[PDB]
Every structure is written in C-alpha cells, then in structure tokens.
C-alpha cells in the first residue's frame, strides 16, 4: 500500500456540517481513547508505528498506558469486529510547546485496506490560499446530523494574513498554524475532533497538512477553524520516528 491513497474513494461532500463519510474512505483516521474506553480526540496514522495528534489531547495524563488508539473504525461506540485497538507505548510532545504530539504504538498497526497511513508534506511548505482540503472526525455536530459516525467536511484554506484580520481571528493565528473553513459559517471541526487530520489532495494522494486544534466556537461566521501547520514540524516528526 501507498500512503494517502484510500482503498475506498471518499465522496465529494456537496464535525459541524459536512457529511458521514463512506466507511473506511479515510483509513488514516484514528480514534484516540482513554484506557477506560472513552473517545476524546482524533489522530492521524502517519506510519505503522506512529500517530500524529494534538498536544493538548494529552494533558489529563503523561503516562502512555493511559491511552489506546482505535484504527479502521467507522462508528464511535459499537465498533466493527475487525477494528484494531493498540496501546500507546510512548508520548512525544513538540519541544517548543506547540499543539502537536506523537504517539508510538506498542505494536505496529497492520496495514490493510481499512488502515493506511497518510503522507507528510515537504518540510516548511505553505498550502496556498483557497486550496480545497478535508477534515474528518467523530466530534460534536451541533445538530448538523451524523452524530456517532465518522464525518467529513470539505474546507478551503485561508491564508494567514487574511485570516488574522480584526473581523476574523484578529491576530491570534501564528505562522505555525493554518486556518480553514467557510467564512459564511456552518462548517467546522468541533469538540472531539482535536488531533484529527486536515488533508489536501495532491496529484494522486492526500497530504496531511494540518492537525485539528482550536477555534472561536465552531462553524461561526467570520471564525474559521485553526490547525497546526504540519509542514513546520516535519523535520521534528521524522527525527522522533527515526530514533524511537
């Protein structure tokens, strides 16, 4: 298998808003769960051993034995039979305290047609203004249907200088972050989607370009969602992977 190439082609959707995904069309989507079985965040499988997520998802415990990753799932609760459920062995937080972290699985994930890593961007690459991307997760829906199933939403990327204007996020967004969403509102990632992916199609595969982090509410007008810019941490991520 090749990274970022799903074995089920995802539906262009005509998480708040968006739609329920085709089962297993996003094979790198991870459900990060407490030791005692509660979904609380998302993550992205970037190789058989490594899960990329948000640092703040881990604040309630520094012990790896407190977390387990769920791979290949479509439902939040009553998981399918062939879902993979691997304990986390190590936790690595980015060393300048940005909102991204790495989990190391205790046994590598079996790569099947339902569990496939996503590709990493070239380091320090800037996703251009108005690039169409996708967000996925099991997060809050605010009555836009799809509760309890893996949802997706198609979002345009909004460049930082525009996103940082007073009428939008008014300076809050750092250069190691990116914004995405519809300025009209109605579509966003929401609570329960943190750590999950923002991927953008390039040539023939999806490239993980952001990690779901924060926002001023969800799906509000003039308030797009903010994501950690994954290309700014690629050299770090690779250094951790190659030494652990």
């Amino acid at each position: 298998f090749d990274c970022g190439k799903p074995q089920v082609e995802p539906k262009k959707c005509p998480v708040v808003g968006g739609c329920v995904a085709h089962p297993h069309s996003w094979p790198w989507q991870v459900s990060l769960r407490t030791r005692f079985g509660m979904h609380f965040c998302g993550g992205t499988l970037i190789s058989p051993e490594w899960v990329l997520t948000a640092a703040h998802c881990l604040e309630k415990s520094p012990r790896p034995s407190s977390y387990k990753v769920i791979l290949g799932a479509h439902q939040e609760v009553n998981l399918e039979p062939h879902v993979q459920e691997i304990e986390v062995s190590r936790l690595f937080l980015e060393p300048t305290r940005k909102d991204i972290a790495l989990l190391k699985l205790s046994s590598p994930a079996v790569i099947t047609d339902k569990v496939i890593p996503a590709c990493l961007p070239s380091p320090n690459y800037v996703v251009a203004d108005r690039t169409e991307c996708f967000i996925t997760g099991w997060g809050e829906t605010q009555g836009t249907f799809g509760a309890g199933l893996l949802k997706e939403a198609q979002l345009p990327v909004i460049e930082n200088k525009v996103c940082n204007r007073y009428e939008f996020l008014n300076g809050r967004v750092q250069s190691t972050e990116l914004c995405a969403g519809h300025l009209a509102g109605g579509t966003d990632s929401c609570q329960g989607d943190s750590g999950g992916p923002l991927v953008c199609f390039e040539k023939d595969k999806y490239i993980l370009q952001g990690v779901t982090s924060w926002g001023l509410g969800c799906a509000r007008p003039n308030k797009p969602g903010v994501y950690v810019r994954v290309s700014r941490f690629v050299t770090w991520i690779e250094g951790v992977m190659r030494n652990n």
Partner: peptide, 14 residues
C-alpha cells in the same frame, strides 16, 4: 475566546 476542540474542550478568555 480560544477553545481547543478536545472532549471536554479547554477554553481561554481570549
């Protein structure tokens, strides 16, 4: 106003 999108979320006065 900044709210991190975990469950449960973490919100700040900005």
């Amino acid at each position: 106003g900044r709210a991190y999108k975990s469950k449960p979320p973490i919100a700040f006065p900005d």
